[PDB]
Structure formats: C-alpha cells, structure tokens
C-alpha cells in the first residue's frame, strides 16, 4: 500500500520569459526552490503518512493534525504554482484582452473588461498579508467569482475552477519590487495568459 | 450586470430519516436555519457586490475584505451542507461498507476499510475546534486524500473533487450528543451514503 | 526539567446562578466539559513537549506543529474560558451599567455606554463562524479596541489585557438559544459583571 | 469623542547596525517601509471606525468585519515590529548567552541555552508560510512557552508577554538570503538583545 508521489512539472517557457515584468532572477529561484520545495514537502509527508497507515508509527510517535496541516500546505503550494506559470505567457503572446466566451460572461457581470480589471486590482490589493487573488468560475452558479487567499490554503471555495491566478507571496515580487506590490499587480495584466484561461473556462461551459 | 443567485437544495429524505443517528431535531434546525442561513447570507452579500461592480456603492462606502471573506463564508457554508445532506441516506440504505471502485481505491491505499475507517476517524477527533473532515479525490495523484478543514473556509485544497463529507460543527450534533462528538462520529458511519460516494467517484473515474 | 501544568479554577458561583440567561444545563457541560477539556489538553501536550525537549522522543517521533498548534489551541482555550466565568455575575450583582473609569473612558471614546451597547453587538452578531467578541485595554494607545477572534487562538492582539470577553462557540448557547445566537448576545449584557471589568481596568490606570 | 492614534518609534540603531547579519538594504525597507505602513494603515482604520461609531457612516456604508480583521492586521503590524527592533542589538552587544533569572529560567525547563535553542530552531523552521517564532513567559504557569504566529495575528496566546520574538515574513530576510530562510534563522542568534530580553522579564519576575 502507498500514495502516489506528485512531481514538479516543466515550466512551460525560459526563465527569462517574462521580462521586463517579472525578472528572471525571481523565476528562476520561484520555480526551482519555492516550487520544487513544496513537490517535495508534500511527497515527504505522504511517506510519513503510509507509515501511520500501514502501522510503522505507533501511537504516540506522530501527531496528526501536524502532518495533515502540513499536506495541505505543502500541496497547494504545488498545485497552485503548477497554475500560476501556466495562467502567465512572454508579453506578445499574454497580456492584452480576453475573447471568446470569457469575455462574454466578464462583459455581463463586470459591465467591461476595464471595471472588472480595476475590481481584481482593487481586490488583490486589500489582501492582508501573503496569499492569492483568483478568479473562479463557479460552475453551480455560473459566477466569476473573486476571491483572494491568505497562506496557500485559506479562503478557497469547494470544487470550483480557477480561471486566473496571481501569486502574492513576497518572494512572488520582493526582489524587483521590493515593498511596492501594487506595482507588481500593475505589471501582471501584462504577462496573463488569456488563452491558456479561455480554453480551461471552456472544459467548464 | 448582475450575478447569479445561489438557491436552497431540498432536502433528500425525511428530517427524521437519520434517527436515532442523528435526531429530526437537529436536522431541522440544521437544514431550515443554517444551511438556509448561508444560501440567504450568500446572496445578500451577492447582491451588495453588485453594487460595488455598477458604482452604486463610491469608495468609502464598503470594505472590501468584509465582502469578499464572507463570501468564501457563505458560499463554503452553502456548498458544504449541500453535499453533506447528500452524502448521508437512511439507516438501511446507508451505512455499511463501500464497493466498486472506490471499495478498491480504500485497499490499495489504506489496506482495508476498516483500517481507513479508523485513520479516518482519528484525523477527524483531532480537529482543533469547529469545521469539517473530509476525503478527496484528488484527480491528479489518484490519492484518497484525507483532510480536515477549519470554519467552512480553511485547509481546502484547489480544485479536487470531495468524495466523503463529515459536518463536525457544534449544531451537527450538540443537541444529541452535547460535548460527545466522538460518539457522533462513531455514529455517523451508520448513515454515511456509498452509494453516493461512489458514483461521484465515477465521474473523474 | 519539565513545564508547570495549568489548573482549572473554581467557578465563581452556582452552575444556575446564571439563568434565566444562561441555563445550569449550558454551565454545566461549558465548565466541567469543555474548559476542564481544555486544562486536560494542554497540561497532556506540555507533558509531550517534555518528552522532546529531553529527547525520550526522536527526530520522527512526532511532528512539532501539530504539537505547537495544539498547545495554542488548548491553552487560549482555558485560559478564555477562566477569564468568562469572571467576566460575569448573577442578575443583581452583574448587567446594569458600568461606573468608575471604564465609564469614563467608553464615553470618551464611544460617546455614551448605550451606543458602545450598540457597536459592540453589531460586532459581535457579525463574526463568521465560532470565536469569542472581547475589548481590550490598549496600554500603548489607551483605546478600549473592540475585536473579534475566530476559533480561540486567531486575530488576538498581543500582550494587552483583555478586559470584557463573550465566548460566541455554539456550545456557549445552543442547548437554550439553538441557532438564535444574537438573542444569547442579548440576554448576556444582563450577567456582565461591571465591577470586575472595573477593577481589571485599574490594573493598568 | 476619537481614538488615539499610533505613533512609529525610533530605530534603537542605525540601519547598518545589523550587518553583516541583517543588511542595511532590508532594515532600510522593513523599518521605513513595512513598519511604517503599518502605523499609517492602523491610524487610517481607527479614522475610519470613529466615522461607523459618530454615526457619519450610516449602515450599508462600511463593511465592519473589514475594518476589525483590518485592525488586528495592522495593529499587530506595528506592535510586532516594535517589539522586533528593540528584541536586537550590534554585534558585540547582542547575541552570545543569556544571564540573570532568563538564563535560569531556560535551564530548569529546557536543561541549557544549547538545547533551548536547537528546540526553537527547529520551531522556527517548521513554520507553514510567513509568520513569527516568539518565546513568551506566561505570567500564569511561570512557562518560557514557545510559538509560532502565522500571519502577525494567528497564533497568540492571551495577554502573557512576548520575551523573544522573530520576524519569519520573506522581507525580513528576502534581499540577502532570498529562499535560504533557515540561514536566517541561524544568524539571527548573533543579534539577539539578551539585556533587553532579561529586564523585559524581570517586569514580571
Ligand atoms: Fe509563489
Ligand atoms: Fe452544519
Ligand atoms: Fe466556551
Ligand atoms: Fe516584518
């Protein structure tokens, strides 16, 4: 008996891609510390977990809240930068507007893509501390509902998509930006990879 | 411009049906003040983003971090008991042990199901306050994923699908159980609704 | 070596002293279940630290943030609930309203005891989820700082004294008040022990 | 009828003070920048709650869970921070060994400084995002209780003064040790203020 392991996937252009708005002395300690990091924290929990099931560890030799507090920590780091590095694209290629139907359902809620993006920007803002802002797509509802996380695993909402994901820990910015990452969130709309959003919307209708 | 409101489930069988589990008691108060609670709270504050989006609202007049966190309240408090009500079914046709496929994951990954049902209830005493335990089905790894969360909002994981669902909040149980939650968790097996569970599984294979 | 264990107090009245605000059913289980929980869960965490701290537990033998979070948890536990049995009286002795200094500085800073009555209700009707409704006594600013904490341990500020405290759990209300938690936040101004408060309060000028 | 308003204190050093520990770049910053904005984002939600409490902000008009979770962020911003300067001192006269009752106190429940520290190291490391270590001595039991604050408001344990305390944020370290957290941690001990922590201590014996 086991768990399978979760592996660290190809970032999906150069390191230096996403210049001059995101450095590429950040990209590349973001992905192969931070996120090869959490690939491996969470694989290095998962074994500690098979041990408590299989019995190897007696009661009395782990604490539980401590190993699956740490799993969630740990995977929602993976899983959460495995999103970030695809929702961003080189500036060409993202950045812009969006089309397709995701502009549909922005231009119905939001009013236009311009109101929708001073609400994102104004939301991601007001974030207390390290975390996220997403855009969701609730599939029950039919919202693009926004949301802004605190840590990795705080304040998301149940099963639901994440359309766009913008990653708001210092060491997200702290090296080109240092304390100004309202800058940083100003630079982001030009690097959001809105095909890479469009196609994933659709896989939901 | 406007968003969708969220709408109250009918309950799937009599608020008596989980007795004597879970006393008619509880379940109404639980279904008709709670859960309506959410899908009213939910909408209300729906509603008063609206008026953010359209400008109805100027800045000044709202505090953003307000909305926005308590509608990952809200709408986790909605989302949750709905999957809650449908993961239990009357003593009888609930209860027992799972099959299929989701009988097979259990034994490749925990040995057995009695020993997930032990791992599985041990991580769920060990919740530090109210919330909720939980088993995902995490689409990537393949794992049965165990998981405690924290409120309605906290220790989530992105995206995956929630195969079992246990409601570990003071209301789901006080009025039977008071300070006895163990018991209620013991008692609980007896209602827990496979059929449901695997089904669910299926969808994501 | 080891760490000094916690004791749990003696409460300061009858378990039905309370009522008809708070029935002796509530007080009851809140004393001799959960606070005296809480005592039992830390002094048996502490004793577990002991056991790290001297090496009887090896690298692998436990998880420190399980440890850790469980301490905060369990020792804010009594250490919130010693400071809420004190915090109210017997109708005659407790509710009315409050004199000497604490008078003085809420009309101050709130303009009068009946709009403080107000904004302190609206406060504490508004938390999402489980926690406690307190007011501190700022010893830097000299604000009487109202807040609200989730869970026992979260959004506490540090090092100051904590100078009214209502325990929101549905554990605190339910058996009596059911879901109906803001008619539990009304009746409770009628045990509030005023002179207490006012005492605290001298402590610090 | 108002609040007092927070004031930013002085730097008990010159900003290249810490080196070559702490770089005079990240003090610069942290100091001028972090700190100082969360004095300014204090002052500007307690202007703000004066208007809900005078009645100039009508209901509807604000959002109160955001401006108290907004408080508890800022507030402790500021306090942390303080409590953080003041917590070290120049090479020479910080770091090396603790004396007095502090020196005593850790022997009798940690069995010497060495062991002590490896336990808070370790502590330190272990925790899940951005936060503080902090070492408090509970004014109750006569503990030297070590813990972790996630954010600079979860975590804390009532009113028991702070004695240690660590900035474990990503811009306290960013600049000079980029993901390297740990190497941090360990150079953190050459600045330690001992003085400053054992008459911190005595205040309370
Ligand atoms: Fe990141
Ligand atoms: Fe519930
Ligand atoms: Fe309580
Ligand atoms: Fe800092």
Same mark, same amino acid.
């Given at each position: 008996?086991?768990?399978?392991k979760?592996?660290?996937?190809?970032?999906p252009?150069? @390191?230096?891609a996403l #210049?001059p708005?995101?450095?590429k002395?950040?990209? +590349?300690?973001?992905?192969? /510390?931070?996120?090869? /990091?959490?690939?491996?924290?969470? $694989?290095?929990?998962?074994?500690? !977990?098979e041990?408590?099931?299989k019995? %190897?560890? =007696?009661?009395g030799?782990? +604490? @539980?809240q401590?190993?699956?507090?740490?799993?969630?920590?740990?995977?929602?780091?993976? *899983? !959460?930068?495995?999103?970030?590095?695809?929702?961003?694209?080189?500036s060409g290629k /993202?950045?812009?507007?969006?089309?397709?139907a995701?502009? %549909?359902?922005? $231009?119905? =809620?939001?009013?236009s893509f %311009?109101?929708?993006?001073?609400?994102?920007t104004?939301?991601?803002?007001? !974030?207390?501390?390290?975390?996220w802002?997403?855009?969701?797509y609730?599939? #029950?509802?039919?919202?693009?509902?926004?949301?802004?996380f #605190?840590?990795?695993?705080? $304040?998301? @909402?149940?099963?639901?998509?994440i359309?766009?994901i913008? +990653?708001?820990? #210092?060491?997200?910015?702290?090296?080109?930006? *240092?304390? *100004?990452?309202?800058?940083?969130?100003?630079?982001?709309?030009?690097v959001v $990879?809105? %095909?890479?959003a469009? *196609?994933?919307? =659709?896989?939901? !209708?």
């Amino acid at each position: 008996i086991q768990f399978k392991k979760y592996e660290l996937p190809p970032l999906p252009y150069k @390191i230096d891609a996403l #210049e001059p708005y995101i450095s590429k002395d950040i990209i +590349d300690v973001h992905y192969n /510390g931070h996120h090869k /990091g959490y690939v491996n924290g969470a $694989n290095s929990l998962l074994e500690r !977990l098979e041990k408590v099931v299989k019995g %190897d560890l =007696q009661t009395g030799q782990y +604490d @539980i809240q401590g190993i699956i507090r740490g799993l969630t920590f740990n995977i929602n780091g993976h *899983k !959460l930068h495995a999103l970030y590095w695809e929702n961003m694209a080189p500036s060409g290629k /993202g950045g812009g507007k969006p089309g397709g139907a995701l502009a %549909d359902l922005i $231009n119905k =809620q939001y009013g236009s893509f %311009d109101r929708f993006k001073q609400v994102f920007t104004e939301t991601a803002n007001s !974030l207390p501390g390290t975390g996220w802002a997403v855009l969701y797509y609730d599939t #029950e509802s039919g919202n693009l509902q926004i949301m802004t996380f #605190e840590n990795h695993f705080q $304040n998301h @909402i149940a099963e639901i998509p994440i359309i766009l994901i913008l +990653d708001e820990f #210092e060491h997200a910015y702290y090296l080109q930006y *240092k304390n *100004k990452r309202a800058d940083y969130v100003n630079a982001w709309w030009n690097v959001v $990879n809105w %095909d890479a959003a469009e *196609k994933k919307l =659709q896989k939901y !209708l």
